[PDB]
Amino acid sequence: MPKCIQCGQYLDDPDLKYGQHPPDAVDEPQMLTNEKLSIFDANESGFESYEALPQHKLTCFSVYCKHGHLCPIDTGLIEKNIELFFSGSAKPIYDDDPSLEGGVNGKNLGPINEWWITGFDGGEKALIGFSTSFAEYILMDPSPEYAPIFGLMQEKIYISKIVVEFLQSNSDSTYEDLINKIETTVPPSGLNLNRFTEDSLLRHAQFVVEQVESYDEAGDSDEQPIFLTPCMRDLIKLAGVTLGQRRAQA
């Protein structure tokens, strides 16, 4: 059972091979220069700092290793500086239509420097983003071939969203209150997720604690902080023991 030297997945899987790029796709710098992605009336002063990477939407997206395999992003490859590239169709940052139309097709984008979750403002959707050396992108819909991979990751992402939004909001609440909140949160309209339960949290406890900590740390200017609220102390304790020990306490 031979594995890819880069992405570590099993090679004897025809489904793994990334297909063709989106039609007439271009490289990342050329893509980013397309007028359809400009939200500026350009003037001799500029609107943003040069220190600030442009940010766009990306739809019909696929992520692959340098040997051409469709690849998940949550298994630690990016963090190990394994190069994951992507393709898809970039769209204006405000655009909420995940269709290919109005997009700029890009190929061999990246590699991805880091990925992240954001959008903890109480809206329906979680936001997943990629950073490259040239731009940031907010994901829309996966390509048909990449959809199964991206789908596998959605449960842990929305448990995290629930938790972050609950903790930022409710600085003196209990584990019991969090479970109640989780149980009463309706999964997102666009997906087919099961209801969330306490065991949902327990199974993803380590990932959830990491997202809280990353949320706090990214706040250079703690606007809605969490840190060590009581509920969070309980979550940290849970995340530091095995799943069986978490469940024993339930």
Binding site: F40, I93, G123, K125, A126
Partner: protein, 73 residues
């Protein structure tokens, strides 16, 4: 008064009472007051264009019930 809407990328809709009088920097303060989002991190967009802190609503032709898009830096 006048009523405008603001979409975040999550689909969250913020409703605001404003007047063609305010600056964009004011609109951001109203957004800050109600959502706790620092104006420094706010980019507002209408008709496909990023708006400038110094200019006023009236100047960008924003009719009643119109929707702005909020993107965070």
């Amino acid at each position: 008064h006048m009523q405008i809407f603001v979409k975040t990328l999550t689909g969250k809709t913020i409703t605001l009472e404003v007047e063609p009088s305010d600056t964009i920097e004011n609109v951001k303060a109203k957004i800050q007051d109600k959502e706790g989002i620092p104006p420094d991190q706010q980019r507002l967009i209408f008709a496909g264009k990023q708006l400038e802190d110094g200019r006023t609503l009236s100047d960008y032709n924003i009719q009643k019930e119109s929707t702005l898009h909020l993107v965070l830096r």
